[PDB]
Ligand binder design. Structure first.
Ligand SMILES: NCc1ccc(OCCCc2sc(-c3ccc4c(c3)/C(=N/Nc3nc5ccccc5s3)CCC4)nc2C(=O)O)cc1
Ligand SMILES: NCc1ccc(OCCCc2sc(-c3ccc4c(c3)/C(=N/Nc3nc5ccccc5s3)CCC4)nc2C(=O)O)cc1
Lengths: 146, 144
């Protein structure tokens, strides 16, 4: 690959492994690593226990390569029609993940990077103000971590 | 920062369902699994390399390199590369136990240097990290 490829990919590998090993002993590579792990765990639990009791939002979107942010935003808003809470933000991440998997399942690989940018924009415009006034991601970790 | 959370979660989720956000996605997961296996099954059978390093704030790369060399004294193989990562992880946990969290980024830098200098040329000739995945990744499905 390109000149720095090995440098980036080795660093990615080292940080991932060290983050994992520290996490297993109740520590963390960084505060951001603690947030990521808590979100991974919360998303898994949402999918295991709570998701099937709600209507399937992926059915509402019916994503295609012609799909733009505006459609994604309108569907995601349904999650927060009764307001923001941490569980609903968790469902939001899980939704994004399910869309990505579905897109690959259906040979629409182009959507994965698209969805990633959709989510970042939705977070910044719609969820960050609530996050900052509700203790930040550090509070999420205290409530959802382990 | 919100982007960093998005990227991590999507990548974790995709790998869970068999897909790769980036080239290292399947490698990270196989390495995590291989490391757990090594620690559970193997580690107790070798001499503890962390005892030889006795890491302190004064420890530099040279000391780390001299100790890790013992792992590869009979050559490189994937098993020893797994042990190498496990070793790095153990030094990091040990550093935090001893309230020396500052050492963690230094150990990570040491690992990247050793990996590039001493391990990567072997990895590149032995089919890259995808080969590690082929051999050490979960192949229970293919076996079925
Ligand atoms: N102890 C660890 C833990 C982890 C996760 C937990 O989640 C609890 C449920 C979170 C939600 S989700 C929610 C909500 C509100 C409105 C709507 C929804 C959900 C809807 N969800 N539909 C979805 N369909 C999909 C499809 C794929 C992936 C995610 C989703 S979410 C459709 C209708 C609109 N409302 C809430 C809530 O608690 O208020 C709890 C505990
Ligand atoms: N199915 C998935 C899977 C995953 C891992 C596997 O590993 C097999 C053993 C790996 C090693 S380790 C090894 C070796 C060779 C020379 C030495 C050592 C190990 C030594 N290890 N000492 C260590 N002390 C520590 C302390 C903490 C963490 C890691 C270590 S490793 C010290 C003496 C010199 N030589 C080998 C080898 O296979 O040749 C196999 C299968």
């Amino acid at each position: 690959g390109p000149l720095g490829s090995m440098s980036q990919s080795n660093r990615e590998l080292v940080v991932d492994f060290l983050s994992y090993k520290l996490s297993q002993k109740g520590y963390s590579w960084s505060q951001m690593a603690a947030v990521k792990q808590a979100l991974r765990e919360a998303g898994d639990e949402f999918e295991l226990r709570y998701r099937r009791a709600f209507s399937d939002l992926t059915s509402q979107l019916h994503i295609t390569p012609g799909t733009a942010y505006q459609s994604f935003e309108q569907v995601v808003n349904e999650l927060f029609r009764d307001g923001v809470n941490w569980g609903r933000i968790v469902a939001f991440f899980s939704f994004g993940g399910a869309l990505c998997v579905e897109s690959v399942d259906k040979e629409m690989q182009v959507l994965v990077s698209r969805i990633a940018a959709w989510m970042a924009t939705y977070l910044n415009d719609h969820l960050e103000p609530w996050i900052q006034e509700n203790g930040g991601w550090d509070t999420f970790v205290e409530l959802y971590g382990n």
